[PDB]
Amino acid sequence: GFFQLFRFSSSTDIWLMFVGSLCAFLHGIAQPGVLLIFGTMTDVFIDYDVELQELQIPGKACVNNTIVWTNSSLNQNMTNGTRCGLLNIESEMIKFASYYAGIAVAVLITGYIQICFWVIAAARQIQKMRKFYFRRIMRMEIGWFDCNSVGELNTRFSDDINKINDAIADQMALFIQRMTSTICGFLLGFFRGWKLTLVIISVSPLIGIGAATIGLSVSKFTDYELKAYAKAGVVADEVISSMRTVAAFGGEKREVERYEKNLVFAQRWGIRKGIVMGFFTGFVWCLIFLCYALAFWYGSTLVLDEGEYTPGTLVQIFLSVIVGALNLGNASPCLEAFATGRAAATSIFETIDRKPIIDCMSEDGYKLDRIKGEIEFHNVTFHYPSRPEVKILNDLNMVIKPGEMTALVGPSGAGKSTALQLIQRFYDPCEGMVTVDGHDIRSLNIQWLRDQIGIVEQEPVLFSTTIAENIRYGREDATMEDIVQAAKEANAYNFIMDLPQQFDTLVGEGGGQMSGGQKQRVAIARALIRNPKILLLDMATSALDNESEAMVQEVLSKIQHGHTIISVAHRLSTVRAADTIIGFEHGTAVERGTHEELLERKGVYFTLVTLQSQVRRILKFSAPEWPYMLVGSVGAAVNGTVTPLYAFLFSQILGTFSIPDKEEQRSQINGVCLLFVAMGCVSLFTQFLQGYAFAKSGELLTKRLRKFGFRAMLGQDIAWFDDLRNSPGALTTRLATDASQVQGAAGSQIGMIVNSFTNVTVAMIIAFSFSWKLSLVILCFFPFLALSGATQTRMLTGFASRDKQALEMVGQITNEALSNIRTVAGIGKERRFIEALETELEKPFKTAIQKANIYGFCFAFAQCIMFIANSASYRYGGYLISNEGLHFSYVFRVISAVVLSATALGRAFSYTPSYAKAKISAARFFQLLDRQPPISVYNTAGEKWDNFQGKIDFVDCKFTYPSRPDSQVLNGLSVSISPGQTLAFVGSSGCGKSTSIQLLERFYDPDQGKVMIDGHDSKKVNVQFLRSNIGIVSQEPVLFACSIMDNIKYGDNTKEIPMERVIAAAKQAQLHDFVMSLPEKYETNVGSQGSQLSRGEKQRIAIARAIVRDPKILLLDEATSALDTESEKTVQVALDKAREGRTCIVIAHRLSTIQNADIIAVMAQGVVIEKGTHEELMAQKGAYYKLVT
Ligand SMILES: C[C@H](CCC(=O)NCCS(=O)(=O)O)[C@H]1CC[C@H]2[C@@H]3[C@H](O)C[C@@H]4C[C@H](O)CC[C@]4(C)[C@H]3C[C@H](O)[C@]12C
Fold this sequence. Notes:
Layout: H1 19-28, H2 35-38, H3 44-56, H4 90-93, H5 119-122, H6 126-135, H7 142-145, H8 150-153, H9 183-190, H10 205-208, H11 212-218, H12 223-229, H13 232-239, H14 243-249, H15 257-260, H16 271-278, H17 285-305, H18 322-326, H19 336-343, H20 348-351, E1 375-377, E2 381-382, E3 393-394, E4 398-400, H21 418-421, H22 446-452, E5 455-456, H23 467-470, H24 480-489, H25 494-497, H26 519-528, E6 534-537, H27 546-559, E7 564-567, H28 606-612, H29 616-620, H30 634-637, H31 643-653, H32 662-692, H33 704-712, H34 734-737, H35 755-761, H36 763-769, H37 775-779, H38 782-786, H39 793-796, H40 804-807, H41 810-813, H42 821-824, H43 831-838, H44 857-860, H45 869-883, H46 891-895, H47 900-909, H48 916-929, H49 995-998, H50 1023-1026, E8 1030-1033, H51 1045-1048, H52 1060-1068, H53 1074-1077, H54 1095-1107, E9 1113-1116, H55 1127-1137, H56 1183-1187
Parallel strand pairs: 5-6, 6-7, 8-9
Antiparallel strand pairs: 1-4, 2-3
Helix pairs in contact: 16-32, 17-32, 24-26, 35-47, 54-55
Taurocholic acid (TCH) binds at residues 31, 34-35, 38, 285, 288, 319, 322-323, 326, 643, 646, 866-867, 870, 900, 904.
């Protein structure tokens, strides 16, 4: 439901929410209830004006004035009784500035009570929710985490509770205002004008639709639009991910052709936002003005013939229906944010109440003492909750006698530690209970059983605080006198002193991490500090370095003894001196004997050891966009001068109820109400054209800015694609967002400084040409009224982003306590990681109690400054009409021209994608748009005409990675060769041999050591020739998302794409049958959805790709990287057949690749050592001579 969002409401918060919604009702009645004053005011003027104008002439009243000039002072001589000084303006406007500025205190002390009493009363519940959700994540099973992610529960803790801090906080408080000035807006019409506020409310739906889908559509056309781009969003991050290969063949000029074409699906999905949000602010201003035509014309029928309405009753019951139906369509952007909250909190409310299978809590269980540790395995069967079909364990029958070690030898991965996770109960066995010295492990205290065991994981993980209190996390009672004994035993004793400081070191996660074989020496001390009765080590030496490998084995083999240890073996020569080895092949322990017990048999480990123990620019860049920023701007003056002109038509009609002669009004009031229709054919025609041509010009820029962007982003070097500041994660999510913040510097910004420049300076003509004296008073409020329309938005969105940097501190303690949940629940308790959330969840509560009372006073004072502006004015306005000759009609004109052109300064002013975040957003693009790269395809392109003939040479080539400074100098190397021959590098696997031939591809550059072609200076040979006459194949497979032929099509970049080698390269590269063994011929889509062919299958495309070409140098850079013993073998024929015209460098990392091709030059430092052939490495050391050694 919806009133389930308030489920966590306490009693101090259901009372801080009633008086914050009594004073929200009682605010919303002000704005259509202030027209009651304004409608008995434009009538008290107009009776003063009628008598004063009739006082002027001595016409029909020949021998007299009416009662004026001593007829009400004589002996009862009042022939009419009314025309006197009996209406005094002095004594009357002091009585309508009392009222009009007594609302502006009780709309100031109840607009800081409707918004400082809800945003307290929401952020006092989301503290109680977010704290309570996390208390019952940490009690779920382990297997519940195995089917719910950790990077997804970290979004449903911060980005999905903050979607129900909008359906409670102010969008409830700002809705029981905007739906009680509709119930009190329209119904305050039917109180008076029941036959006139029906001929207006019969057009009130057709404004109530249009005011809705202005505010609602901007919050709807974001994700409606953000996904129409992303068809381009893969073609960008395909190539930028696969950048080596597209630049391997030179196919760059036809790789903006897949990004010139495929961009138009958002080139016309953002035009279409310009109409639909620009036409609809015309179709409220075509409907207000035409409603004024139908209210004034039809209303002037009644007010003149019946007399049943008075002229102040007539401007009061349609200015209560306009502001009565503005809010009803301005509460719909506030009722979208309930159905967003109500439908995105059903995940949280389903996690709070599942009541898990195993608590990891204390009370509900059974307690046992003096534990021997008779560990038992009765006949289990066991699925995962992730993969529920595979049977990991089957009828597993084995015992563990207490006091000694016990091994576990699986083949590779059958029951390695899944058998062992049950003894600490991360999973219940579905059949076959297991028992511990009598009583079983189910129906016992989880917080007692998890005290006795002690786990040592595969990979170490350490928590963020001090290493002397990280070991404290097991056995909470222990002190520094007792901590120090375990770090002694677990080899941290020299790591006391070599460490920067003695036992306070934060940098276990904080400053700088230790080595992978070193954190484990902490984790042994963590499990040993608790005085455990069970040790459980599951591949402690799984993946760590060979030095401390043998060092931590000394911790376990030589030192560790005394009680029950259930262990496994990474290598079993360590456990060769132990008690029992109960290894198995599948789910059932078979052997249970020592190594001499399986000398006589085969079993599970004797079988194993037979084979293992052997600013001006943005305009000038948009210079072809001149007709769509001048007919877009002529259409932005002529509806910027509509608001100021309206103040002159509306205040014209209001003086024309005062003229005495009856035929003149019905002629005159029918004249001015005809002008409102003509301002309904204009201010829709030019509110269309101010939202169309400023959104073709903001979309014919950002289409041509992307295509120029991706011609330069493609045509640069590899040396910064691998750079840290711009990786392909950020080099394609820049190009989506930053290309859209660059329309807001040219297109829709000249529709602001000429919208709100003709809006203001035609208002100051009207405001000063009629009475300058009354326009000094009100213009003293022109700063406080325009600038207050856009100072809460710049406050608020700069004050959600100070919550985020107060809540990212919470997103630390979460993510270090869900990503490693198997180590939290295994060691002691998670009480510590619950209790360290309440202490960190006060801190985003103190910056949402300071979004109460600085979003009170920027919202109360943003709303009583236009009710005090109508009180300093008309107080002084009454001073003018009485003793000066400023007649009545000019006071509604001076005031409606500098309030309507003050709000529509700011209201227009917040339609700006901010100019400061475009110039700092365009400047991060022009440097890309004109960068000078060190080597380039778009450079001097005429140094060629050398037929290669395989005389390619090295002379002592040094090399660096300038983007990854691991070393500083790779050693020089000098190799020359003859055509049709092989260099055949084998040697250093780390930056030694593949890198020294990926250098030969012009991807990186020689640090020194000039290479040659035919005595040529290779940097003075252009890349378009040189990169054409070669051909590579990648180590790892990476192709496109196209079909089979479309990558063999891709084998040339400029040349005539062959169909005659489609037949030949299929049979030359071993795939002429595999292209036929598929059910289809060409439609085998290789990346998108069709076939997830294996690495041995997928490479067979790639050898076929370059073999269509006619190159001089082959680059067989580490193929046959698959262990698939026939797919590895079959592809070897492809590398061996492609010869005879190929000056190759085929590496032969393994023995199966050919060794008798030619010489070997490289070695461990990248030095030309042992230059001779295969038959010369027998005297000295060799690679084959090392693997036999
Ligand atoms: C006079 C109306 C409400 C009065 C008001 O603002 N109340 C508080 C101060 S006081 O009581 O007028 O003293 C205002 C409120 C909203 C206004 C409308 C909105 O601003 C929308 C457009 C704006 C255009 O510039 C003019 C037509 C118009 C359709 C406006 C006509 C008129 O000025 C309205 C209907």
